[PDB]
RNA sequence: ACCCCCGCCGUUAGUUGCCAGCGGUUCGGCCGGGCACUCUAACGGGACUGCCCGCGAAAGCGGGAGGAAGGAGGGGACGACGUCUGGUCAGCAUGGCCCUUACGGCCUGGGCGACACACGUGCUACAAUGCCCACUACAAAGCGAUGCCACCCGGCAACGGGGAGCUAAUCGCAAAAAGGUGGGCCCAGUUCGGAUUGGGGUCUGCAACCCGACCCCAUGAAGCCGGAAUCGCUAGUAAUCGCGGAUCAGCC
């Protein structure tokens, strides 16, 4: 991206919740463009969040994303010799990309043999504030604020 | 080593084929090898006539062939005695039974193939290459043409190091797909070696 | 592509499996197209001249 | 019911050709089914540009064959008169099966 | 009496015939839900209807040939969008801002030579 | 249930289980069950003593299995190996027999790579 | 898992030349370039010398090696 | 997978027919 | 820019097409019929910052309306003067040097397919977002005369025998695969993965030892996601799935 400021592709809302954020998450689950299996998994999961949890799936989901969005992250940088890890805010845009990505990743890191479940259970755990997803998130912030000395290299 | 043949590039437009006849699968390869046999002799013979093109139309066992020349005389013959020898030497090659028309070239000074051969020859006779070239561009440029250009290969003057000579005037847009640029190549066997000759002539446009 | 090795025209395959295309212009046995009798090179050379009836340049 | 099938390399040497056949017989037979097109069959020849190596040179050559039909039902002598011997194009070749 | 709108997408053609009625859809014979048996996207095609509170007011006979059931779902979506205009041409005002009256021109990209897939370029080592 | 030469496939589908025998594959599996008319899906444990006898007898007597088989195969190789048979020499030399390339890719027959010293500057890339 | 079909092939250079020797019993040597031929019983006991593509190697044909094809007993390449 | 010559895919991949990918 | 392919509309043309619309039905668009529609291929229209608001001296930048579409709408063909003493005398052409019972020519056989090893480009894979069986659904572009091979029969099968149509928008290759539905597997080197090897056999071809592809049985390897290092791709792209073609007896 040397020229323009590459605008963000706008996604078509969910075919059930009409929520764009959902499509996004579904796209992060998808692999080899098998978007059906991807959509299914997320919906089967939403129905697993309905059973084992008396709450509306959609709200559990958004809640999750929320706890998994890092607000500070460390970015490397060469400053006089060594490569000091400068701590800095995270764009609203990047927060999402990371949150969703992390969820799917940690979700596929779980044990339960069923794809749709790993997502179901991961989302919930995330909502409660536990789970591999939120780990990474809190690990990131920890990383920054632990290198908050080189923060005068603001960037 | 770039750039396409200016003709083959424009075949869709500003330039028709040298053999326009339908055919297919079982015939095409046979019906084409022939055309080459044809052209083969004509160029081997009608050299002094000043060959420039050999259109070859067809329909069935009644071929066309319309040799284009600068000196239609040399072709025909005395009263038309040679156009008898060839026209016959023709069927001794293709039982097919074919004609043999002859159109004259209106100013061989706008026939890339001719201008080329023109230069190719001089070079064989040992004329100063650069001169022969400049002259040629002039002739061509001096008798119509909105642009022209000639190129001689290498070993100019028999020099041990192969070179490459130029010469050009007026627009000669090889890129413009609609120019109508006549392309002509001439060889040039020599005591020291082959030296290709390229002639480019630009006419009108649309 | 030695005259000597253009015994391909000899028919006499003794067995028809010993038969082989060969260029009908340069002898370029290596990549001779059927529909033309010509090798990948000559096919390209002639297509440029226009001596290949209705054989324009592709593009799409 | 004389079915004509015209094939040519030039999409004009036919529209010209097959069109003559329409205006002609349109004064001695039925009224012709109009020159119906018909899909074109293209032959691609993908060739390496130069000799010796350079696997990725290429350059494409295609030999597209075009077709036309027409169809004249109600054959009436004069039809086979205005057509029989009055063609013109050279880059064409017909096949008819009434 | 009847309404028409074609609709093409990524190489798919859908003949859309609306007709004042219940709101059912016969895609190539099978029921709307029968041809698209289990495709989380299907719902899309009829979106141009809900656009102007149709569906339970119309009905649709649809012929679809070409491409894949996904491309067809978009051709059909465009069909139902066009036809819905021959009926009341006033629908544009709300049907267009959604972009339903556009013909997604995204098509497969030619496979160029030298490369594996039009773009996917072959890889090298110790270049 | 124990079937052929020291065969004891258990707690899995009978077909699958029969596979655990030397001369039985997914093919002979559905057949031996086909003929002997036994559900293939039955867990070997849930089988019947009647079925285990028809199987035990049909299989053991219908195909050459286990040890006796390895005996044959070994016997074969030994043969084309005793006679100047090229194919037999490929066994001795330990190189692939079915005419494959031995300049690269023959590890399944050669074993682990046996690296040696070599020639650098001569783009062996 | 070899296979020819119906008609075990054997060049008749050595065939009709091997059985001719079956009339007087056997002989003392042979030599054919037909390593392309299958081996038939009548060859047994005999001693045909096949061609490396350079040499004529003496191959004693026994029963155990019938179905094979001569060349399988006359190695081509030289290694180690 | 695409490589098992005695399965549906293995046959499809190798563009063939047999006991595992019959004609119909 | 002028040319080609893809986006939208119209005219001409209807043996492709559809009850769109009517009558019949072995209810197969099968029948009559009908060109509307899809389409087929030829031509014509359409985009130019042309119109509206904003800044600017201008070019133009931002924004908005209409529109299938825009500010080069998306993909090709197309590569300047020259550079690298770049590549190819092994495609062909050609100066010079060299060989002429041979550095020519024919043949049979072998070799180009060798291996202790090193590298490049790839295929398949290590699995449950998966594998297997069954049922069922959408494609495009191509190719077909001894050639594609319908359908029927013998074979588990490759394939063999018989034989219709096609001269190929009207017949065949052809089954698209991923996908949807139902079942099995239940986390194991396994119903993952198919190397390797034993046996039987088909097919082409004079001939498949060296050295063909295919089928069926048995075998069932390494591989549980890869060190340093390193490659591709900015959208219908990457990723993934199958389909065709050239060469071509057959086929690596
Ligand atoms: Mg051959
Ligand atoms: Mg693709
Ligand atoms: Mg398997
Ligand atoms: Mg202005
Ligand atoms: Mg340009
Ligand atoms: Mg050099
Ligand atoms: Mg060199
Ligand atoms: Mg080699
Ligand atoms: Mg059968
Ligand atoms: Zn050639």
Curated annotation (Swiss-Prot), chain B:
Entry keyword set: Ribonucleoprotein, Ribosomal protein, RNA-binding, rRNA-binding
Domain KH type-2: 38-106
GO terms, biological process: translation
SUPFAM superfamilies associated with the record: Prokaryotic type KH domain (KH-domain type II), Ribosomal protein S3 C-terminal domain
Source organism superkingdom: Bacteria
One Gene Ontology MF term: structural constituent of ribosome
CDD domains to which the protein is assigned, alphabetical: KH-II_30S_S3
Assigned GO CC terms: cytosolic small ribosomal subunit
Coiled-coil blocks: none
Name of a matching Pfam family: KH_2
Job of this protein: Binds the lower part of the 30S subunit head. Binds mRNA in the 70S ribosome, positioning it for translation.
Assembly with partners or alone: Part of the 30S ribosomal subunit. Forms a tight complex with proteins S10 and S14.
Family assignment from sequence similarity: Belongs to the universal ribosomal protein uS3 family.
Protein name: Small ribosomal subunit protein uS3
Curated annotation (Swiss-Prot), chain C:
Disulfide bonds: none
Pfam families the UniProt entry points to: Ribosomal_S14 (PF00253)
Name of the gene encoding the protein in the UniProt record: rpsZ
Keywords in alphabetical order: Metal-binding, Ribonucleoprotein, Ribosomal protein, RNA-binding, rRNA-binding, Zinc
Residues at which Zn(2+) binds: 23, 26, 39, 42
Function: Required for the assembly of 30S particles and may also be responsible for determining the conformation of the 16S rRNA at the A site. Binds 16S rRNA in center of the 30S subunit head.
Family: Belongs to the universal ribosomal protein uS14 family. Zinc-binding uS14 subfamily.
Tagged with keyword Zinc: yes
Name this protein carries in UniProt: Small ribosomal subunit protein uS14
Keyword rRNA-binding: yes
Gene3D superfamilies, A to Z: 30s Ribosomal Protein S14, Chain N
UniProtKB/Swiss-Prot annotation, chain F:
GO CC terms of this entry: cytosol; small ribosomal subunit
Pfam assignment, any one: Ribosomal_S13
Superkingdom in the source lineage: Bacteria
UniProt keyword GTP-binding present: no
GO biological process: translation
MF GO annotations: rRNA binding; structural constituent of ribosome; tRNA binding
Keyword annotations: Ribonucleoprotein, Ribosomal protein, RNA-binding, rRNA-binding, tRNA-binding
Coiled coil residues, start to end: none
Region entry Disordered, spans: 94-125
Family label: Belongs to the universal ribosomal protein uS13 family.
PANTHER family: 30S RIBOSOMAL PROTEIN S13/40S RIBOSOMAL PROTEIN S18, SMALL RIBOSOMAL SUBUNIT PROTEIN US13M
HAMAP family the record matches: Ribosomal_uS13
Task performed by this protein: Located at the top of the head of the 30S subunit, it contacts several helices of the 16S rRNA. In the 70S ribosome structure it contacts the 23S rRNA (bridge B1a) and protein L5 of the 50S subunit (bridge B1b), connecting the top of the two subunits; these bridges are in contact with the A site and P site tRNAs respectively and are implicated in movement during ribosome translocation. Separately contacts the tRNAs in the A and P sites.
Subunit structure: Part of the 30S ribosomal subunit. Forms a loose heterodimer with protein S19. Forms two bridges to the 50S subunit in the 70S ribosome, contacting protein L5 and the 23S rRNA; these bridges are straddled by the 5S rRNA.
Protein's name in the database: Small ribosomal subunit protein uS13
Curated annotation (Swiss-Prot), chain G:
InterPro entries linked to this entry: Ribosomal_uS19, Ribosomal_uS19_bac-type, Ribosomal_uS19_CS, Ribosomal_uS19_SF
Pfam family, one: Ribosomal_S19
Keywords: Ribonucleoprotein, Ribosomal protein, RNA-binding, rRNA-binding
Gene Ontology molecular function, alphabetical: rRNA binding; structural constituent of ribosome
GO annotation, cellular component aspect: cytoplasm; small ribosomal subunit
Presence of the UniProt keyword Ribonucleoprotein in the record: yes
Residue intervals passing through the bilayer: none
GO biological process: ribosomal small subunit assembly; translation
Protein family (similarity comment): Belongs to the universal ribosomal protein uS19 family.
Assembly mode: Part of the 30S ribosomal subunit. Forms a loose dimer with protein S13.
Function of the protein: Located at the top of the head of the 30S subunit, extending towards the 50S subunit, which it may contact in the 70S complex. Contacts several RNA helices of the 16S rRNA.
Record's protein name: Small ribosomal subunit protein uS19
Source species: Thermus thermophilus (strain ATCC 27634 / DSM 579 / HB8)
Name of the gene encoding the protein in the UniProt record: rpsS
